[PDB]
Amino acid sequence: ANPLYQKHIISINDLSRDDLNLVLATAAKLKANPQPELLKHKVIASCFFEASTRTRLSFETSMHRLGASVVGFSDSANTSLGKKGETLADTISVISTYVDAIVMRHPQEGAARLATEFSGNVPVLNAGDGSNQHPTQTLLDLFTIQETQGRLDNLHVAMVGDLKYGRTVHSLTQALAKFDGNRFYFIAPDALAMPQYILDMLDEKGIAWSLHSSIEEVMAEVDILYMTRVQKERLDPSEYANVKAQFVLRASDLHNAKANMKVLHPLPRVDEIATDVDKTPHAWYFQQAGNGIFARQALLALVLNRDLVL
Amino acid sequence: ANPLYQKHIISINDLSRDDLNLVLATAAKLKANPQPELLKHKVIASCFFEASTRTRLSFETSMHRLGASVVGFSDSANTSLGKKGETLADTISVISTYVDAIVMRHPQEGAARLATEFSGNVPVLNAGDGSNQHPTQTLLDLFTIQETQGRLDNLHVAMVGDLKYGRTVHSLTQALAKFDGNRFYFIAPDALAMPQYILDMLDEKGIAWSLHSSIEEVMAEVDILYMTRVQKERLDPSEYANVKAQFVLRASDLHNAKANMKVLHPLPRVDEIATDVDKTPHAWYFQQAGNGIFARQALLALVLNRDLVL
Amino acid sequence: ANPLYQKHIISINDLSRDDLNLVLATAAKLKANPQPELLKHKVIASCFFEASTRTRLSFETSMHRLGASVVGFSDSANTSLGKKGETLADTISVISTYVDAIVMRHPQEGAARLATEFSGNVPVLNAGDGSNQHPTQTLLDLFTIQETQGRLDNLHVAMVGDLKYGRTVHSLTQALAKFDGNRFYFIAPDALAMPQYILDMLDEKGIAWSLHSSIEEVMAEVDILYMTRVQKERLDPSEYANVKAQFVLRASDLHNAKANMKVLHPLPRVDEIATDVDKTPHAWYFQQAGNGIFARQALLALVLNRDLVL
Amino acid sequence: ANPLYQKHIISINDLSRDDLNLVLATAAKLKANPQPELLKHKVIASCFFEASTRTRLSFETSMHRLGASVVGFSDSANTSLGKKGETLADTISVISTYVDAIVMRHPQEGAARLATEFSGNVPVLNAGDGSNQHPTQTLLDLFTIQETQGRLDNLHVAMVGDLKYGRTVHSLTQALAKFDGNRFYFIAPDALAMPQYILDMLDEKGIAWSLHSSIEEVMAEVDILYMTRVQKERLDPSEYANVKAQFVLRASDLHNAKANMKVLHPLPRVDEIATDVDKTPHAWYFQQAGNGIFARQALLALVLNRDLVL
Amino acid sequence: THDNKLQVEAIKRGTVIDHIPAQIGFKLLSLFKLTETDQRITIGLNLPSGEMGRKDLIKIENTFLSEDQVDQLALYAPQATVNRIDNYEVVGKSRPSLPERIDNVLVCPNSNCISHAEPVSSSFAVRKRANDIALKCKYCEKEFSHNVVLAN
Amino acid sequence: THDNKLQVEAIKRGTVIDHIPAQIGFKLLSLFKLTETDQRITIGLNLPSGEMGRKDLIKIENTFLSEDQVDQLALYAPQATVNRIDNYEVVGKSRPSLPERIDNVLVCPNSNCISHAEPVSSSFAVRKRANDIALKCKYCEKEFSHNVVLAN
Ligand SMILES: Nc1ccn([C@@H]2O[C@H](COP(=O)(O)OP(=O)(O)OP(=O)(O)O)[C@@H](O)[C@H]2O)c(=O)n1
Ligand SMILES: Nc1ccn([C@@H]2O[C@H](COP(=O)(O)OP(=O)(O)OP(=O)(O)O)[C@@H](O)[C@H]2O)c(=O)n1
Ligand SMILES: O=C(CP(=O)(O)O)Nc1cccc(NC(=O)CP(=O)(O)O)c1
Ligand SMILES: O=C(CP(=O)(O)O)Nc1cccc(NC(=O)CP(=O)(O)O)c1
Ligand SMILES: O=C(CP(=O)(O)O)Nc1cccc(NC(=O)CP(=O)(O)O)c1
Ligand SMILES: O=C(CP(=O)(O)O)Nc1cccc(NC(=O)CP(=O)(O)O)c1
Ligand SMILES: [Zn+2]
Ligand SMILES: [Zn+2]
């Protein structure tokens, strides 16, 4: 069996550099050579206790691209699993008697790991648990970076937006800090600055990082410009208006950008990336989203197929 | 490749007489000789930004009758695709990196054509866009007419109901005006009369049409009696009560009807067609609805299978 | 005891020309000579089964200007004083044992008429019953007209907008037809034309009326231009777009208006009257609303006091 | 005629030190010598476009304590007196023709300022406009401070909690900066620090202020400890957990408090002040709320009466 | 002509949109972004005209307008004359002819049209009727009078 | 404008806004609705200049600007020269002093400001700072850098 066969995928802190490389390697193969029957006869539960159309459709499409059948639910208005008030423990206990793997998104931090303790032989893949983890997004981000940059080591990486609350950037930062020589640029209004614990983690691992207030301060030397959505309720409307330009990108801001530079954004953009950026060779967010399919296939493949044929 | 391979199906005005005949021909073949594996390994998105159980189940069933896998959503409470406020453009941009064809219903006129400009190589089939188009309904109506009447030319066609707002009747009228010698009877309260632009279109194409206030005025000579649902909010309750008999059909109204005459209604009926009509050989609305499957299969078949084996 | 003492105020059809004048004559008196303790000790119910902020605040203010106390509810209700099924009859039988008069607004036609059959000795004032009557809105309209024109006879009256569904334009026309020599001009698209039954009543009384397509056609002859809101929630967005742009009033349209001409609107005006009209001397919709307080005070005082020495 | 006669009460910035004293001096008079018929015959509108139970009941009680009638609405509204689009301007143009003064609370900044531009001769009292002003909450605060300390000069004032978003702490600071020799202590985590613009205004006026991490640091010197509620609906649950536990007041923290020290809180207090504080002599938040009636009565009487003989 | 009482000068090459109705020169400058160039431009508004009283006139220097581009002015300035000036010589008195299609500058009167808060360019199919031009939206597929489309 | 021979001529009575930065002329015509008149206007866009290299020039006959209407051009063309003119002589000449209040043209960057959906015109209190102008909205009472207010 491969390293990830029958394992739970809860956090990016539980995955090693080899594990990631393994997922991307597999992703590449599946992207290149499709295995439409690989998980034929498997039934996967798509459990969205928290609605999320783009992640659920991405995941479910990955499921069908491998041949597996799907059962599930979205936005559980009330409980879900014989609606009422039963525990998440009981819900997973039951659903794990029906399926071969559970993919779940939940509004409470910890939900995916708790499910792990009740699922038995059934693996659970965390599609998002409150402001904690979102491993499949990081895997797709990592895949996109490595494919367009040729590597995950010695990269100049800029992260713009709500560095404070966005779980994706925390997650991506830690994953990249498992690789050697990456250089970080954190552009955010101080009210949404990258947490002190992410900076410590990088200090210890001896990683270079700097704070900037504008994209143009470092535009000329970044390989990946990773933008995030700044939650608008986080801020006061006037406050949000006064810092808004700090984290918005236009086509003209890309004048001195490196040819190799790609712009990623987990979506939705709309308030951060202007549409005139879409037509430039740097825009790579929709391509990035497409790569969630290969990363998600790789993951289900690895976890559910003992002997992976590639 | 067939004429409709990889094409978008947005409006009935983009389809030619040959195109329609092609769909019905294909529909007939599929109805006669099922191809359960024809779209095996294809993943289709069933995107109902506007909920519609009967059209979505009809479409999705058509999808599975061909062997394709399905992903999708209904009644998008908020946005849909990482719920928030992103554009429909962005939503389609992403979903088109996941699927082989997008079937969508939307409350805004134009939605299906806009999606066309962002879907790339992915075809989109319009399952309904506000009060504009509904091509798959017309195709099923056309199929039902041709199968029970043996032809689409030289027919006596009656349209009753809300001729003003119902997109189905406008659409069906135009499709039939692509065929020679059809005769129309428009029975509607003047407050819901068939638009002046549909009458002009018919004047130019030199087509015979007349206005009637009662079904019995022409019952004796119609081949197809196409009933529509009169929206009740459109009218004042008392107003609706005073015109209500104009557009309701009972078994007794069929005394002098031609043997060949069939009654169609896109559904739901309930306020227009009495249940004593169901047991007569003229009732054909449930059969008509069944034909949405063959028409929808034909369509997905043609659009997604370059070399159609029949 | 005055002619209106202890009488219900349900319909404009039940009020004579003399009744109308009495009300307007008392409203002018109270406007000039306030009697803040006239209804001191009286408790009135403000029952808005159908939420209605402007009307309710107007009515309640009138109540207080005469010194009465108020109890009531505005609901947008969930069977208020019903509990899944209590009849309007029983809720009035209860409330009429509490208060001295009932002011009510309801979504169903006839509601106020039904209440008078269960309120015993308590007068019922109709604040609107579905698409039927709104007698007090017509009294304040007539008062505004009499006060600015000095008469309700021999006027040139143009009514613009949605004449088909507007219950206030129907009552105003009926009320004005109780006086002599008035001439009406109706400006509406065909879909919202003033109903034939209204036209039949005028023809039948020797009252001249005409249909015109724009305000410019009547402007020079009009004394009162009554704008009504388009029940847009009834039309297709496209449809409401074409008609809207036509029957909108701009200040420049008033270039040739007579010096006594007044623009009235039961409100809300939103798309019908441009804000630059507000500054012209013809703008009189806010003044009309303010007159609802004197029209309503008059009505209350006449119904609750045998004789008023004003 | 008093300086505040017929003036709008929109912003603390518009009120002078003398205006402040006048209001507090009248509030002390009315508190001691009630004038229950002073506003007899006046009708006031209680317009809470934004629901606000405590404030509205406080204001409405003040209205009745002076003998005025009240009409209004508290909504949590669905465009109250708008109908999908009527402007706040028009709803004020209507209401100002009904009442003698308008008391309003609204979710958007500037709303009350806009109203004064459409209410003609009717005074507008702002009961809160988004994150901008809440002048009457500051008047009652200042009254509570003056009454318990005997002055608004030379005070030691600590403000604890969410200083960044609290509009009441911003107004209280501004108001107190109109007096001499006050010293401020700000206790807040960094994410909720008192804004730089407030600190700039104080620096610019020679007013000393300091930042401290706990209440124990200032306790012995504080005359007024003003607690504010944490806008927790803004922070991550974890984040709100860490900060909460710090800036919570327990009775034991008051061991070294001065005899005149008073604990104030605009309320609701829930997680900020432990119930064992309520029994101490320093607990004065309920008393402060009760003082909102005298602050608000004063304000109403001054605006509606040329001269008060109290 | 009216170009030499006081000199608004005559240009060498470029175009000279002449005979623009009063209060339309500015619209053209806006709707079609004519000032977003570095070329020397000279405009005259409310200049006198013998056949209409007043008129407007735009002079974009050494910049020419295609056959279609000139037809794009027809909805705003129909009885207007464009001039394909070549070295001081008026060489080509073109004229706005109604186009089949009108892109980008119009707005779909239909509030429910998908086109409104989306990153697409408006597009209308043009046609004369009773002679008032019916404009048909590419997206909406609804048809309105040029006076409803143009109102806003 | 420092140049002669091939340009736009002088007028008798009216105002002439000179030394307008390139690409700011059209913006001034829009923002302040200057073409919204019957009087005769003449505009020169991207005119060669001795001092500024290039600039825009606006001439409005029979129209005059108060010193305050002049100051409103301060946030756009601060180095501009407004010329008062009667009987072909420059009767008066003034330059934009930044005003203490700016109405109608700016918009409260605050999306929750009441000014937006409402029939009111914007209004900001102006006050200078070391590196910018601070704009305070009459309604929201929020203050923003002129760089935020002016930007899109
Ligand atoms: N080198 C040139 C030549 C002509 N024009 C302008 O082209 C327009 C038309 O000139 P022309 O057709 O030669 O004579 P008109 O009498 O103006 O034509 P019409 O009667 O149609 O107005 C005028 O504004 C003229 O100033 C120009 O600006 N530069
Ligand atoms: N009757 C007039 C007089 C002058 N002007 C224009 O208005 C400005 C007047 O400039 P002038 O009085 O000659 O002084 P300058 O040499 O231009 O120096 P400055 O621009 O600093 O005033 C120039 O653009 C001139 O062409 C005009 O349009 N009509
Ligand atoms: O593309 C996605 C997944 P989806 O929107 O659920 O389909 N992004 C995503 C999903 C879930 C959580 C987050 N959290 C973030 O902090 C990223 P962002 O703020 O840019 O959406 C981001
Ligand atoms: O059978 C259908 C499709 P469904 O109800 O969505 O499954 N009819 C349908 C669907 C969508 C729009 C319309 N529009 C019409 O005008 C037909 P009708 O008024 O009879 O429902 C009609
Ligand atoms: O939404 C309102 C205010 P409400 O009466 O307080 O509910 N409508 C209202 C108020 C007062 C009078 C009228 N008159 C009308 O004719 C209503 P419409 O013109 O919408 O049929 C309508
Ligand atoms: O929920 C309430 C009661 P409401 O005013 O009646 O809506 N809040 C309230 C009431 C009275 C005063 C204040 N003062 C504040 O500063 C509100 P916050 O501290 O939440 O910003 C806040
Ligand atoms: Zn459209
Ligand atoms: Zn503002």
Place of tokens 């109608």: F104
Write out the two tokens for A98. 């029906």
- Side chain identity at C115, as an amino acid letter? A
Domain shared by B287 and B143, yes or no: yes
Listed in sequence order, the residues at least 6 apart from A287 whose beta carbon sits closer than 8 Å to its beta carbon are: A144, B97
User: Do D152 and D18 meet the contact criterion of CB atoms below 8 Å apart?
Assistant: no
Listed in sequence order, the residues at least 6 apart from B209 whose beta carbon sits closer than 8 Å to its beta carbon are: B183, B184, B185, B186, B199, B202
B111 Cα: distance to centroid of ligand 7 (angstroms): 10
- Concerning whether D178 is annotated as a catalytic residue, the answer is no
Write out the two tokens for B23. 């769909």
User: Do C148 and C156 meet the contact criterion of CB atoms below 8 Å apart?
Assistant: no
Q: Where are the domains of chain E?
A: 7-99, 100-152
CA distance D53 to chain C (A): 17
User: Inter-axis angle of helices B135-149 and B285-304, to 10 degrees?
Assistant: 120
Euclidean distance between CA atoms B295 and B206, whole angstroms:
29
* Ligand 5 binding site (Cβ under 6 Å of any ligand atom): C 52-56, 134, 137, 166-168, 228-229, 266; D 83
A-D interface: how many C-beta pairs under 8 angstroms?
A: 15
F115 Cα: distance to centroid of ligand 8 (angstroms): 6
Query: In chain E, whose CA is at the least distance from the CA of C246?
Result: E148
Q: Is C42 annotated as a binding residue?
A: no
CA distance E111 to chain B (A): 9
Beta strand F133-137 pairing with F143-145 = antiparallel
Write out the two tokens for B131. 């009060």
Start-end of H helices in D210-260: 237-244
Q: Is C84 annotated as a binding residue?
A: yes
- Concerning whether B84 is annotated as a catalytic residue, the answer is yes
Domain shared by B10 and B122, yes or no: yes
What is the number of the ligand closest to the CA of B106?
A: 4
Write out the two tokens for A42. 């498997």
Place of tokens 């056309």: B142
Beta strand B224-227 pairing with F41-48 = unpaired
DSSP calls for C126-152: EEEETTS--HHHHHHHHHHHHHHHS-S
* DSSP label of D193: P
- Concerning whether D279 is annotated as a catalytic residue, the answer is no
Place of tokens 């960094």: D190
Domain shared by C100 and C220, yes or no: no
Domain shared by D119 and D193, yes or no: no
What is the resolution in angstroms? Answer: 2.2
Nearest to D166 by CA among D189, D190, D195: D195
Is D83 an 8 Å CB contact of chain C?
A: yes
* Ligand 3 binding site (Cβ under 6 Å of any ligand atom): A 52, 54-55, 128, 134, 137, 166-168, 228-229, 266-267; B 82
Positive/negative CA dihedral, D228, D232, D236, D240: positive
Please, what is the Cα angle at B226 between B224 and B227, to 5 degrees? 145
Is E112 an 8 Å CB contact of chain B?
A: yes
Domain shared by C283 and C150, yes or no: yes
| Residue numbers of the domain that contains D229 | 134-291
**Which ligand 3 atom sits nearest the alpha carbon of residue A56?**
7
Domain shared by D77 and D51, yes or no: yes
What is the number of the ligand closest to the CA of A234?
A: 3
Among E108, E110, E114, most C C-beta atoms within 10 A, so best to mutate, is E110
Decide: B105 in ligand 4 pocket, CB within 6 A. no
Query: Which DSSP helix (H) or strand (E) runs through E40?
Result: none
Euclidean distance between CA atoms C205 and C11, whole angstroms:
20
Select from D49, D55, D272 the residue to mutate for testing ligand 6; criterion: most ligand atoms less than 8 Å from CB.
D55
Q: Do B109 and E118 touch (CB under 8 A)?
A: no
First to last CA, chain B: 13
Listed in sequence order, the residues at least 6 apart from B117 whose beta carbon sits closer than 8 Å to its beta carbon are: B89, E120
User: Within 13 A of B100's CA, how many CA atoms are on the CB side?
Assistant: 20
Q: Do A267 and B94 touch (CB under 8 A)?
A: yes
Euclidean distance between CA atoms E39 and E61, whole angstroms:
6
Instruction: Give how many domains chain D has, as a whole number.
Output: 2
Domain shared by C125 and C143, yes or no: no
D5 Cα: distance to centroid of ligand 6 (angstroms): 27
Euclidean distance between CA atoms A25 and A237, whole angstroms:
44
* CATH code for position C119: 3.40.50.1370
Bridge partners, A128 (sequence order) = A105
B188 Cα: distance to centroid of ligand 4 (angstroms): 18
F11 Cα: distance to centroid of ligand 2 (angstroms): 10
Q: How was this structure determined?
A: X-ray
Chain A contacts in chain B segment 25-44 (CB below 8 A)? 41, 43
A-B interface: how many C-beta pairs under 8 angstroms?
A: 66
D76 to B252, C79, D48: CA distances (angstroms): 54, 20, 8
Catalytic residue among A8, A42, A55, A156: A55
Beta strand C156-160 pairing with C124-129 = unpaired
D81 to D89, D95, D99: CA distances (angstroms): 11, 10, 16
Q: Is D31 annotated as a binding residue?
A: no
Sort D212 into a burial class: Cβ within 10 Å, 0-12 / 13-18 / 19+: middle
Q: Which of B87, B89, B130 lies nearest to residue E112, judging by beta carbons?
A: B130
- Concerning whether B54 is annotated as a catalytic residue, the answer is yes
Domain shared by D169 and D271, yes or no: yes
Pick the CATH number of E7-99 from 3.40.50.720, 3.30.43.10, 3.30.70.140, 3.30.1360.170: 3.30.70.140
- Concerning whether A54 is annotated as a catalytic residue, the answer is yes
B266 Cα: distance to centroid of ligand 4 (angstroms): 6
Chain A contacts in chain B segment 61-80 (CB below 8 A)? 69-73, 76-77, 79-80
| C–B contact: 3+ Cβ pairs < 8 A | yes
Residues of chain B contacting residue A268, judged by C-beta atoms under 8 Å apart:
79, 81-82, 84-86, 90
User: Within 13 A of F91's CA, how many CA atoms are on the CB side?
Assistant: 13
CA torsion angle for F6, F12, F13, F17 (degrees, to 10)? 20
Q: How far is CA E17 from the centre of its chain?
A: 9
Positive/negative CA dihedral, B281, B284, B287, B291: positive
Write out the two tokens for D187. 């206790």
Q: Is F137 annotated as a binding residue?
A: yes
Edge-to-edge order in the sheet of strand E101-103: E101-103, E123-127, E134-137, E143-145
Query: Which DSSP helix (H) or strand (E) runs through C116?
Result: helix C111-116
Is C270 an 8 Å CB contact of chain D?
A: yes
Edge-to-edge order in the sheet of strand D156-160: D208-211, D183-187, D156-160, D224-227, D262-264
User: Do A104 and A49 meet the contact criterion of CB atoms below 8 Å apart?
Assistant: yes
C230 to B132, C80, E95, E109: CA distances (angstroms): 23, 29, 42, 17
Question: E-assigned strands of chain D?
Answer: 43-48, 69-74, 101-106, 124-129, 156-160, 183-187, 208-211, 224-227, 262-264
Write out the two tokens for B267. 């559904």
Domain shared by D171 and D29, yes or no: no
Domain shared by B7 and B108, yes or no: yes
Query: In chain F, whose CA is at the least distance from the CA of D11?
Result: F141
**Fold topology of E100-152:** SH3 type barrels. (2.30.30)
Bridge partners, C248 (sequence order) = none
A3 to A16, A127, A143, A238, A304: CA distances (angstroms): 10, 20, 19, 50, 12
Nearest to B167 by CA among B191, B194, B140: B194
Domain shared by D112 and D254, yes or no: no
Domain shared by D188 and D106, yes or no: no
Nearest to D282 by CA among D229, D230, D223: D223
Catalytic residue among D8, D42, D56, D134: D134
| C–A contact: 3+ Cβ pairs < 8 A | no
Please, what is the Cα angle at E116 between F113 and A284, to 5 degrees? 95
